[PDB]
Amino acid sequence: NTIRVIVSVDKAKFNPHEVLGIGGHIVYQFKLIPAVVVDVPANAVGKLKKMPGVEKVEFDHQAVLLGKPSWLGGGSTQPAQTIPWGIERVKAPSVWSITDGSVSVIQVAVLDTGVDYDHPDLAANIAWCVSTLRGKVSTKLRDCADQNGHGTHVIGTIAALNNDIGVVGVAPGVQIYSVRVLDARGSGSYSDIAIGIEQAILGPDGVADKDGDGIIAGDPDDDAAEVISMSLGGPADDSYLYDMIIQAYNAGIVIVAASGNEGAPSPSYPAAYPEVIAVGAIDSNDNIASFSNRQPEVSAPGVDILSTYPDDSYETLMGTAMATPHVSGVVALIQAAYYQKYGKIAPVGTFDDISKNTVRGILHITADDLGPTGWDADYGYGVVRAALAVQAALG
């Protein structure tokens, strides 16, 4: 009988009781942007628009996961640790002796279906679990656990442990925050995904900048993530969500997102935003996958990708969702190594960037440039390479 909407407001004029008085419900008041997620009856949407302090009324759109089980491969047919082909393709393993991600100030937030937080090849890296489903922020593990599989697979491509079992991530020492914004079927509301972005900025302690110095990502006094990774996509561009992507970007957080799997001519949202790295998928032959949405920023392995899967298991998945965490891994290695040497993180940088002084510039100039020379609509700048990116970072 009610509909979910996201109102952008003037905080000094807006009275939430007025929503309540028209038979509405306050779902979530954002700490970092001037907006509130509310449920209202249909009849009331008109009233909302007129109420004092309400500047925009946006409806709640849907995004979905961007990984599916592979047509080809299977599980980890081997009790030893396997290095999935993708981890090698992005030249991660040689980097680990310089850093594997385990620099204390670095956390990577993965906004997905949740995580199997007990998985033996993941657990020691899972630093915090949260769920924002239906706009209720929960840190009960039973609410944060993965009921799909996809988030556990994505998290394993970034950070599965480097040991003698399972698989291994691009950044196998990096601390992960699993932020569950998608349900058991892989579907999520934009309102929950924006709440998840907020949570990755706030971190475990619920405060963005606890010491007031204006540094959030790359402040060891705070517990903000440095990378937000979204292996998901929807078709709408909404102002409140972009407002949140901007808060994370201004916080110094690198945001990375799947381009989409529809062979479409451009990326889905939030990948399509300027402030987000859109990632396409290649296969084990260096061909762009036919399903990969075009004009990404970079590309990475996304076909026939073995990783962790719930109940202490392993599965082979495909999609731009699988490509995304390879790039999130590489970004974590860049920021870890950058901080380890300089005692701060590097700036995020722009889509455009070709300087060795920003994360995005480094990723671009060190990518393996495939297909047409330079940036192209299939590969973007090319396949990310961690070993070269770290060398560029420290140079």
Residues at the interface with Ca ion (CB under 5 A): 81, 105, 107, 121, 161, 163, 166, 168, 203, 205, 207, 209, 211, 213, 215, 219, 221-224, 369, 371-372, 376
Smallest distance, Å, CB 341 to Ca ion? 17
Token pair listed for 232: 């998901």
Smallest distance, Å, CB 35 to Ca ion? 20
Phi, psi for 138 (deg, rounded to 5) = -125, 140
Taking Cα atoms as reference points, which of 111, 391, 393, 93 lies closest to residue 276?
Answer: 111
Strands 313-318 and 305-309: antiparallel
Token pair listed for 327: 């790039």
Nearer to Ca ion (CB atom), residue 16 or residue 93: 93
Q: What is the DSSP string of 233-294?
A: EBS---HHHHHHHHHHHHTT-EEEEE--SS--SS--BTTTSTTEEEEEEE-TTSPBPTTS-S
- Measured in residues, the chain has a length of 395
Cα–Cα distances in Å, from 258 out to 27, 237, 336? Answer: 28, 15, 23
Cα–Cα distance, 159 to 92 (Å, whole number): 12
Task: Please report the sign of the dihedral spanned by the C-alpha atoms of residue 256, residue 257, residue 263, residue 266.
Answer: negative
Cα–Cα distance, 177 to 157 (Å, whole number): 14
Smallest distance, Å, CB 161 to Ca ion? 5
Smallest distance, Å, CB 177 to Ca ion? 9
Smallest distance, Å, CB 321 to Ca ion? 21
Nearer to Ca ion (CB atom), residue 41 or residue 220: 220
Residue with tokens 């994505």: 154
Taking Cα atoms as reference points, which of 33, 174, 201 lies closest to residue 111?
Answer: 201
Cα–Cα distances in Å, from 82 out to 53, 86, 87, 161, 282? Answer: 56, 11, 10, 11, 20
Smallest distance, Å, CB 276 to Ca ion? 19
| Residue 367 CB contacts under 8 Å (≥ 6 apart), including other chains | 298, 380, 381, 382, 383, 384, 385
Smallest distance, Å, CB 52 to Ca ion? 32
Nearer to Ca ion (CB atom), residue 347 or residue 371: 371
Nearer to Ca ion (CB atom), residue 223 or residue 283: 223
Nearer to Ca ion (CB atom), residue 251 or residue 271: 251
| Residue 114 CB contacts under 8 Å (≥ 6 apart), including other chains | 129, 131, 144, 145, 146, 147, 148, 151, 152, 178, 180, 182
Smallest distance, Å, CB 373 to Ca ion? 6
Q: What is the DSSP letter of 346?
A: P
Nearer to Ca ion (CB atom), residue 61 or residue 89: 89
Nearer to Ca ion (CB atom), residue 64 or residue 383: 383
Nearer to Ca ion (CB atom), residue 189 or residue 316: 316
Token pair listed for 274: 């300027």
Nearer to Ca ion (CB atom), residue 32 or residue 168: 168
Smallest distance, Å, CB 246 to Ca ion? 18
Smallest distance, Å, CB 54 to Ca ion? 29
Nearer to Ca ion (CB atom), residue 146 or residue 223: 223
